[PDB]
């Protein structure tokens, strides 16, 4: 259950919260899991997805073992566009198909300074949690 009496559990309120979320919050929502290779390495389950991560689509039509680079993150549409995840429109032109980040898995992260520090913080809180449980 949820006990904290300032949170909500209320369809309409959590749905409003979602569809009217502001960019910086939508970053957090549009996270996706890391691969079991990276999970082992960094001690982190999931990361906010970003413009040029390498990525596998997991479920849907484009469900495959091809590792495509992310192209752009459309936070207004809650979706990401991926290198070869595309479909031909009527008139031959290609169009990047939207994939929701949660149905994607990150194989190669784009490591900047900030991202590194996020990974370091998450792994730290995990290890504190494991030490507390022990």
């Amino acid at each position: 259950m949820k006990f904290n009496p300032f949170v909500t559990s209320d369809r309409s309120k959590n749905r409003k919260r979602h569809f009217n979320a502001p960019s910086h919050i939508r970053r957090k929502i549009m996270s996706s899991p890391l691969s079991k290779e990276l999970r082992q390495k960094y001690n982190v389950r999931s990361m906010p997805i970003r413009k040029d991560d390498e990525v596998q689509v997991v479920r849907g039509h484009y469900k495959g073992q091809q590792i495509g680079k992310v192209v752009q993150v459309y936070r207004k549409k809650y979706v990401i566009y991926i290198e070869r995840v595309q479909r031909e429109k009527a008139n031959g032109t290609t169009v990047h198909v939207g994939i929701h980040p949660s149905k994607v898995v990150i194989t190669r992260l784009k490591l900047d300074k900030d991202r590194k520090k996020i990974l370091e913080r998450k792994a730290k809180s995990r290890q504190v949690g494991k030490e507390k449980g022990k």
Binding site: S9, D10, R11
Partner: protein, 259 residues
């Protein structure tokens, strides 16, 4: 419903003589809503017949003794495997029906422990059933934070939370009760009398202190004893084929004299 709801308009009746129908009609304007119909429960816009008030008598009060009677009955029938089984609880493999347990069960601080216990006591097919029952509620409840529904599970009466109520918490179905503070809404859910319970020796001993035996007062609820019985031999078959009774009957006329 709101006090104003319906009456926010200013609508006079065009009187009789204009054809139409002696309703109060919205005054003037170059809108759709003009010469329409206001106020009458029948009208669109309108105003519901006898608007619901806040001061409806929502709460309902009950005599103390009657509540205590109720809770005795409910306890009484958490024994009786028939009634428990009829209330749907899969109590086939359970070892002894007023199921009392060691008081390390106060100890437990992890669900893992709490679940293993239930599996040892063979109560786990009840939770396993609750898991199977989990499904979408039909109807408008769905859009009012009653979206999922499932079974009631085993009750667990504990004497003191030394950790237990954390351990049994995530296990779906299980309600926990303090003995000192029993509840009829939980021991007899749906107003239905059976319900499989799992007692703790510490709690189970305390019942006689709480409710009192038949020759001892409550000794905890000031002035209270158990309700008396209206008849003692409840199995009437034993009575009806006794020597004392059948000795004094007329012999049964059972020929059938048809027309």
């Amino acid at each position: 419903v709101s006090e104003l709801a319906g009456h926010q308009t200013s609508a006079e009746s065009w009187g009789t003589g204009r054809a139409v129908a002696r309703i109060p009609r919205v005054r003037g304007g170059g809108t759709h809503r003009s010469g329409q119909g206001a106020f009458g429960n029948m009208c669109r816009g309108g105003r519901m017949f006898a608007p619901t008030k806040t001061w409806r008598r929502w709460h309902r009060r009950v005599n103390t003794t009657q509540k205590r009677y109720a809770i005795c009955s409910a306890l009484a029938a958490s024994a009786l495997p028939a009634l428990v089984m009829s209330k749907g609880h899969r109590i086939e493999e359970v070892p002894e029906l007023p199921l009392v347990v060691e008081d390390k069960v106060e100890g437990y601080k992890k669900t893992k422990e709490a679940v293993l216990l239930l599996k040892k006591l063979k109560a786990w097919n009840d939770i396993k059933k609750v898991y199977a029952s989990q499904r979408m509620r039909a109807g408008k409840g769905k859009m009012r934070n009653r979206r999922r529904i499932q079974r009631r599970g085993p009750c667990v009466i504990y004497n003191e939370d030394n950790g237990i109520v954390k351990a049994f918490r995530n296990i779906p179905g299980i309600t926990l009760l303090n003995v000192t503070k029993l509840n009829i809404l939980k021991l007899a859910p749906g107003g239905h009398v059976g319900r499989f319970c799992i007692w703790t020796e510490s709690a189970f001993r305390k019942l006689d202190d709480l409710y009192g035996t038949w020759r001892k007062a409550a000794s905890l609820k000031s002035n209270y004893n158990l309700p008396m019985h209206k008849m003692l031999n409840t199995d009437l078959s034993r009575i009806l084929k006794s020597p004392e009774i059948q000795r004094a009957l007329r012999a049964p006329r059972k020929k059938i004299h048809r027309r």
